[PDB]
Amino acid sequence: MAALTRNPQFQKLLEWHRANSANLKLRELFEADPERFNNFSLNLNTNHGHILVDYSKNLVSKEVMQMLVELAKSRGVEAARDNMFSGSKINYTEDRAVLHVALRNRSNTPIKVDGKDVMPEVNRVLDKMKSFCQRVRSGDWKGYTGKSITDIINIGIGGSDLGPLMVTEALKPYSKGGPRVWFVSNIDGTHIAKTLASLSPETSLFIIASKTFTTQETITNAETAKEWFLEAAKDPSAVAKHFVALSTNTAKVKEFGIDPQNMFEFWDWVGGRYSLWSAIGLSIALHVGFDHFEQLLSGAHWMDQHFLKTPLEKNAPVLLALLGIWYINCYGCETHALLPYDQYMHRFAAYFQQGDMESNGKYITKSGARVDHQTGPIVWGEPGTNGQHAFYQLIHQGTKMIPCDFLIPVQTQHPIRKGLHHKILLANFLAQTEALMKGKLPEEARKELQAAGKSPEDLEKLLPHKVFEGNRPTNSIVFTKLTPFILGALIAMYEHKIFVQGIMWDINSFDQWGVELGKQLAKKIEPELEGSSAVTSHDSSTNGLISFIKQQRDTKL
Amino acid sequence: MAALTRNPQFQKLLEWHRANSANLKLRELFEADPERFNNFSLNLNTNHGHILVDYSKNLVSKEVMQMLVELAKSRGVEAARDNMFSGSKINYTEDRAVLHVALRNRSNTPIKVDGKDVMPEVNRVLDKMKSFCQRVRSGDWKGYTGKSITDIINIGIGGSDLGPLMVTEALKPYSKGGPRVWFVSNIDGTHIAKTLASLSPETSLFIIASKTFTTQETITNAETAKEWFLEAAKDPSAVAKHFVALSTNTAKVKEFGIDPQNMFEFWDWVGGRYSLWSAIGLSIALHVGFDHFEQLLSGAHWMDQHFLKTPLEKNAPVLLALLGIWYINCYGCETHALLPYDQYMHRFAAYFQQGDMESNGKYITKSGARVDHQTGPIVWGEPGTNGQHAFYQLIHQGTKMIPCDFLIPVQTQHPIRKGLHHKILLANFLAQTEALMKGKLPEEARKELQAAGKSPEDLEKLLPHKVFEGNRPTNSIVFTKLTPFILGALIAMYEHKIFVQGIMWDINSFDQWGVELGKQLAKKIEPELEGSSAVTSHDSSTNGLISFIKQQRDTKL
Numbered sequence A, B: 001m002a003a004l005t006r007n008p009q010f011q012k013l014l015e016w017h018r019a020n021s022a023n024l025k026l027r028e029l030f031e032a033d034p035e036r037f038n039n040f041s042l043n044l045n046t047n048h049g050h051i052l053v054d055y056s057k058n059l060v061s062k063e064v065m066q067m068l069v070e071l072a073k074s075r076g077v078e079a080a081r082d083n084m085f086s087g088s089k090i091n092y093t094e095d096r097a098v099l100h101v102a103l104r105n106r107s108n109t110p111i112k113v114d115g116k117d118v119m120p121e122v123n124r125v126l127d128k129m130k131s132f133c134q135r136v137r138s139g140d141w142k143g144y145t146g147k148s149i150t151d152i153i154n155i156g157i158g159g160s161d162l163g164p165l166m167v168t169e170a171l172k173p174y175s176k177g178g179p180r181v182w183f184v185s186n187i188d189g190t191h192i193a194k195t196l197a198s199l200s201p202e203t204s205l206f207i208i209a210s211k212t213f214t215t216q217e218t219i220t221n222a223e224t225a226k227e228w229f230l231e232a233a234k235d236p237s238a239v240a241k242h243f244v245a246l247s248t249n250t251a252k253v254k255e256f257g258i259d260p261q262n263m264f265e266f267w268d269w270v271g272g273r274y275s276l277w278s279a280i281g282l283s284i285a286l287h288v289g290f291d292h293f294e295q296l297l298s299g300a301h302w303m304d305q306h307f308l309k310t311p312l313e314k315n316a317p318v319l320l321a322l323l324g325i326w327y328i329n330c331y332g333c334e335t336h337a338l339l340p341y342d343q344y345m346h347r348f349a350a351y352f353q354q355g356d357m358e359s360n361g362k363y364i365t366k367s368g369a370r371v372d373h374q375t376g377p378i379v380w381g382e383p384g385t386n387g388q389h390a391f392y393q394l395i396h397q398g399t400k401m402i403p404c405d406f407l408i409p410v411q412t413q414h415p416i417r418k419g420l421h422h423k424i425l426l427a428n429f430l431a432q433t434e435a436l437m438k439g440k441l442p443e444e445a446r447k448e449l450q451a452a453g454k455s456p457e458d459l460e461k462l463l464p465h466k467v468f469e470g471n472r473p474t475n476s477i478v479f480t481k482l483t484p485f486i487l488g489a490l491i492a493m494y495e496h497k498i499f500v501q502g503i504m505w506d507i508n509s510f511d512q513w514g515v516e517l518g519k520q521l522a523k524k525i526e527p528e529l530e531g532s533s534a535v536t537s538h539d540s541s542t543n544g545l546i547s548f549i550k551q552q553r554d555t556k557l
């Protein structure tokens, strides 16, 4: 047994679910209570736009929410939160603080690690980033032939890739006057090859993004970039004009051959999947300008303050977390879908697929005991409206329960045709959650079949296929506009959702020991692939696949 | 109850699972039997490359596979397949044939629908596509000001978008000397707006891809494109040089104002999510050339013939389907991950997320019974190695069982640094499935921590976190090279896997009444967004969300 399952508030919740959950029907919940939306939503005013978190289309009553809040309290969420914010070493397996909140601490109130305020160094690096952004964006920073930089290439993977990629994509309209940004991440040589093919060494600046500065994919990609660069420049001293580093590892940055003044530092208490707020966000700041980067940080700071100050029962990330606990630990739902009705947000789901799954895909608790309950869900999704044509069939008429978060800005960045496209986009956003809740009754579908001129036989056969059970719960998250500030608040909101769930499960949201085995085994296989000799050192499958590779790699097609 | 659960071969399978599955341990299965790879893999020689389907790292024995094959026979898979290939109207809810196999029927053996061979019309459209491709790609086809076409823009959604998108991405190296290709799909105005900003009306050719030619997103996007075009051209006759249609609806194509000689026809028996093989594939053929499109079709034809003629026990799509049934209906796994170790394949998982989930996300059977068992899984994934740094933490050390298909070409399109990148990519591909299979025992992790220099205290604290339980099953699908032919074979293989699972569940893989519902939903909300008036006609959530939209849409940020 584990902390969560031994908790009496959890036991009460589970027993309530067993006895009563069959009585929960969304249609009836709304019919019984005209104040339902009012009581089961949060309209947050940030002073820079509103964020409406509408959780009313969920399979919860007032009683269920009360039990969930009581569980958050009795799992120590409030104390755990305060410990994060104060610099306690809550990443217990690595003995590190967890301080992405410090990166965006706009108030500059001291946050101490080992008795020392981290804010001076946070701000020093931010100042460095700002200066660098001015130099590059103005054209003052020259390439080896004296030309202004037109292209920036981030080289990094996972935490050193997805954040900057997702954010630059989401904030594309804010990039006027900024250099083009490219993201190279996969070791697959296709990635760097196709990127370099469209670039000039004279006007391209590479950003080597790596906490450790030892990740194989990133260092290999970086060395490939440098080789390509030096082929043209034929001068090792020119590297300082075209390569900068975002890292915690001064020594390995120097060994690679980058100028010490070209290093933008971060700290061990910045987790990779929580790092876009640090030096790692340099490509964001370059692309959209430092002012917009500061706005992004400020939005996160607003949400941090909301999370810190707000009673749990009306605390947005807490409520989202609690709904997830309900669906995961009581209903047994494996997945959570993120469905932004926004093309600019097209990498948002992929970002939180990392942020969520790498954080909470854990099975060992703080005491060292194995969990005897579910932890993190599989996170997935694609932007609306496309999903409606693609996998919503399964959401509407399959055999899985799938909690979905639908997200949309009220105002579009592109109000073409006098807002026609956005009107339609909004209408779909609204209609889909409504339909997921309501479904379609036999009496409704029957009349439709009759009106279509179906024979009595055809109607009878078709009817069950046209009926939708509904009762599919959703969150609707609606915000004034997707500005840098609002985007920052939204990312931070989900960061804190993930944190609350982790605390409740008694797991460490901030380590990632599960990547180690794959890395070890790959290092062993790498040298074995070279040459013609048979590999027999593994299981028959691994050996068999290697044999196939060696046999097939010289075939001409 | 339903056909599957009433089936005695299924109940035998399930009973065996209950009694025996806990005793299946992958590490031990491989140690006990050096022939395991040999007995649980298929090395397919297509004469244009090999496809190795290695299913040996699955939680199966000879006996499990025997029971699964017997179940497939009991469920009448072979007869159902033959019926699909013969043009029987197996899409029973829409009374339609299901004949994507006819689209790529290179043999030209007659396939009849309603007594009439479909092949002459299939080939007539293919010939038209070929002629059009030559004219555009050669530069002969001129725009309204007399310039060659430089950009092609597919406008379509769902089945009319994702296939052409995924395939042109996957076959990018084959696009030298072809026009740039763009995909516009979302109604979100951002999609068309950002596309048009990069284009000239003089040199852009639009492809309106829509089976019905009534889909709201597509027709709206098309009308927006046409307005933009006509603002520049100022001549309705110029539309014929810049707009073509891929459709079954001649009348609606004419209504939109497209030249009848600019219409590339397909048929009702071509499902949208099975349509890239038809006229819908025109953007593929324009981008990579008709010869490469023909190779794509040929590869699918090879796999069709494999599916049609091979005994079930050695039939690749059947075996993949059966392994899925094992994990879905016996283990209860909600999801299936597709993990291609290939950047060009970056939209492959998204494509089959649609192909699989829209096909098999169903709950009514052929008999009209509601299923009392699971149907289609949630399909998801991202290319390796990035996934290793995003969500593999959860796959390795979470609380979910997740069947994964790992896919890779032996030969890379970009053998940079003398093959160094691809070597590392292959090493990771192999290591990850080995790691998922093997895990790491407490005693193995203990020895590692001891050797690392950890104190008895630090070791004990860290130990449980370093343990990998393993026993996580995978498929490895390795192919000589990702050519058009091999890609075609791989897509068809998964199409047929989906088909087999559908037959076994007794559902219609080929309708989409949930998607049809969708296309009926937003029309009611649309007029309610106009004006400042409060909406009280829906449930309080829909009402409240509409109120928020109206309150927030004029705010200046």
Ligand SMILES: O=C(O)[C@H](O)[C@@H](O)[C@H](O)[C@H](O)COP(=O)(O)O
Pocket: A157, A158, A159, A160, A209, A210, A211, A212, A213, A214, A215, A218, A271, A272, A273, A274, A354, A358, A512, B389, B390
């Ligand atoms: O924080 C994380 O999400 C993980 O630790 C991981 O995804 C990490 O970010 C990458 O492996 C890049 O690591 P480096 O920044 O050290 O190159």
Ligand SMILES: O=C(O)[C@H](O)[C@@H](O)[C@H](O)[C@H](O)COP(=O)(O)O
Pocket: A389, A390, B157, B158, B159, B160, B209, B210, B211, B212, B213, B214, B215, B218, B271, B272, B273, B274, B358, B512, B515
């Ligand atoms: O076949 C499918 O998978 C679905 O029917 C759906 O995804 C369809 O492709 C789109 O709604 C576009 O429909 P049109 O091609 O008619 O515009």
